[PDB]
């Protein structure tokens, strides 16, 4: 299959990227360098991950060494919730550009549909522990995102963790200038997301699957929680194809026409994760993997369930 797919801005996006959430600042620079050395062209970033400076060191060195040209890279970042106010969007984007040491992003996403009160704290709380919302309309945040395109700071704009009604809200925005190119959502065999994916694909929005290995290093994981990497049923499919369980899990969303962004800071796994273009899962393998859906969501943003725009009360 093709290594890239077409976005609605006319640009091509690599279907495999390196994720960077939870990548420690002292390891992520080498992780990104190794990834580029072994062929990765797409890096997934965010201000809220607190490691964009270190990711940027890697990118700049590989550009300087001429291992890769800038035109060949596809760098994604995300607008954090405390910057939804129209007057704060450009500055948030500029800070990410400055840290990553780039003059443009290929894709900039609204990280969550929930706006929070601006300030130093990424999750501003009231005295009772609830997150403090922003009154800024998501449609006004979208207009501010559209300005970044017209100013040359980003080539394309998109959304993340938007449910189908929230996606519909943007597509129906009065005076909509640029459609979302991408919706980035959790997706793995325990949360297959058929309804939201088909909706987005029906609208011409490309879906990026995050946490495709089920984010076993997430901070709130419990010892008894399921593990995709150790599921014997997935291990069997992997063994059959002479591949690893991670390679199956990465190949899975690729054959659903999704982009996928597995995270690792381990050089061997970074290399292994990229070797998924030389085999094919059967339609039977695909349907079997899809059958494992348990609606098991690992990124539920549990501290914000009271927020007006919390996306996961809705069925899809
Ligand atoms: N938009 C959003 O709201 C959102 C939310 C979550 C994630 N994301 C993005 O999606 C990316 C990936 O999701 P994620 O970080 O949650 O989790 P993930 O990619 O599902 O899993 C990462 C974990 O799997 C391990 N791993 C990676 N490759 C492996 C392999 N070949 N064999 C065994 N273990 C392997 C990693 O270990 P080591 O790192 O120690 O090798 C790490 O512990 C994120 O980093 C982020 O860029 C976005
Ligand atoms: O991308 C990271 C998300 O904010 C985790 O909840």
Swiss-Prot record:
Keyword DNA damage belongs to the record? no
What is this protein's tissue specificity according to the annotation? Highly expressed in embryonic epithelial cells (EUE) in response to osmotic stress.
The biological processes this protein is annotated with in GO are: C21-steroid hormone biosynthetic process; carbohydrate metabolic process; cellular hyperosmotic salinity response; daunorubicin metabolic process; doxorubicin metabolic process; epithelial cell maturation; fructose biosynthetic process; metanephric collecting duct development
This enzyme catalyses:
an alditol + NADP(+) = an aldose + NADPH + H(+); all-trans-retinol + NADP(+) = all-trans-retinal + NADPH + H(+); 9-cis-retinol + NADP(+) = 9-cis-retinal + NADPH + H(+); 13-cis-retinol + NADP(+) = 13-cis-retinal + NADPH + H(+)
Molecular function (GO) terms for this protein are: aldose reductase (NADPH) activity; all-trans-retinol dehydrogenase (NADP+) activity; allyl-alcohol dehydrogenase activity; electron transfer activity; glyceraldehyde oxidoreductase activity; glycerol dehydrogenase (NADP+) activity; L-glucuronate reductase activity; prostaglandin H2 endoperoxidase reductase activity
Per the Swiss-Prot or TrEMBL record, the active site comprises 49
Please give the activity regulation comment for this entry.
Cys-299 may regulate the kinetic and inhibition properties of the enzyme, but does not participate in catalysis. Tolrestat inhibits retinal reduction.
**Pfam families per the record?**
Aldo_ket_red
In-chain residues carrying the UniProt-annotated modification N6-acetyllysine: 95, 222, 263
Q: Subcellular localization, per the record?
A: Cytoplasm
Q: Keywords for this entry? A: Acetylation, Cytoplasm, Lipid metabolism, NADP, Oxidoreductase, Phosphoprotein
Under the heading CDD domains, the entry gives: AKR_AKR1B1-19
Sequence positions that bind substrate: 111
Cross-referenced Gene3D superfamilies: NADP-dependent oxidoreductase domain
Q: What is its EC number?
A: 1.1.1.21, 1.1.1.300, 1.1.1.372, 1.1.1.54
Q: Which residue positions hold the site described Lowers pKa of active site Tyr?
A: 78
Q: Is the Lipid metabolism keyword given for this protein?
A: yes
Top-rank EC class of the record's enzyme = oxidoreductase
Subunit structure, briefly?
A: Monomer.
For this chain, the family text in UniProt reads:
Belongs to the aldo/keto reductase family.
State its role.
Catalyzes the NADPH-dependent reduction of a wide variety of carbonyl-containing compounds to their corresponding alcohols. Displays enzymatic activity towards endogenous metabolites such as aromatic and aliphatic aldehydes, ketones, monosacharides, bile acids and xenobiotics substrates. Key enzyme in the polyol pathway, catalyzes reduction of glucose to sorbitol during hyperglycemia. Reduces steroids and their derivatives and prostaglandins. Displays low enzymatic activity toward all-trans-retinal, 9-cis-retinal, and 13-cis-retinal.
Protein name in the entry: Aldo-keto reductase family 1 member B1
**Species of the source:** Homo sapiens (Human)
């Amino acid at each position: 299959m093709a290594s890239r797919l077409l976005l609605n801005n006319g640009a091509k996006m690599p279907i495999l990227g390196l994720g960077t959430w939870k990548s420690p600042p002292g390891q992520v620079t080498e992780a990104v360098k190794v990834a580029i050395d072994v062929g990765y062209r797409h890096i997934d970033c965010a201000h809220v991950y607190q490691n964009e400076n270190e990711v940027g060191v890697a990118i700049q060195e590989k550009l300087r060494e001429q291992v890769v040209k800038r035109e060949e890279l596809f760098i994604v970042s995300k607008l954090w919730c405390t910057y939804h106010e129209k007057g704060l969007v450009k500055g948030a984007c500029q800070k990410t550009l400055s840290d990553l040491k780039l003059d443009y992003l290929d894709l900039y996403l609204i990280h969550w549909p929930t706006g929070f009160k601006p300030g130093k704290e990424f999750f501003p709380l009231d005295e009772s522990g609830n997150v403090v919302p922003s009154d800024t309309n998501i449609l006004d945040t979208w207009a501010a995102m559209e300005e970044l395109v017209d100013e040359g700071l980003v080539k394309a704009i998109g959304i993340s963790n938007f449910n189908h009604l929230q996606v519909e809200m943007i597509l129906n925005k009065p005076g909509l200038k640029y459609k979302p190119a991408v919706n980035q959502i959790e997706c793995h065999p325990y949360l297959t997301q058929e309804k939201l994916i088909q909706y987005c694909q029906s609208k011409g929005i490309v879906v990026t699957a995050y946490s495709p290995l089920g984010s076993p290093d997430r901070p709130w994981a419990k010892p008894e929680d399921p593990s995709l990497l150790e599921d014997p049923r997935i291990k069997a499919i992997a063994a059959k194809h002479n591949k690893t369980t991670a390679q199956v899990l990465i190949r899975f969303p690729m054959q659903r026409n999704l982009v996928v962004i597995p995270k690792s800071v381990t050089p061997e796994r970074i290399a292994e994760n990229f070797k998924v273009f030389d085999f094919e899962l059967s339609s039977q393998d695909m349907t079997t993997l899809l059958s494992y859906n348990r609606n098991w969501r690992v990124c539920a943003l549990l501290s914000c369930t009271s927020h007006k725009d919390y996306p996961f009360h809705e069925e899809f």
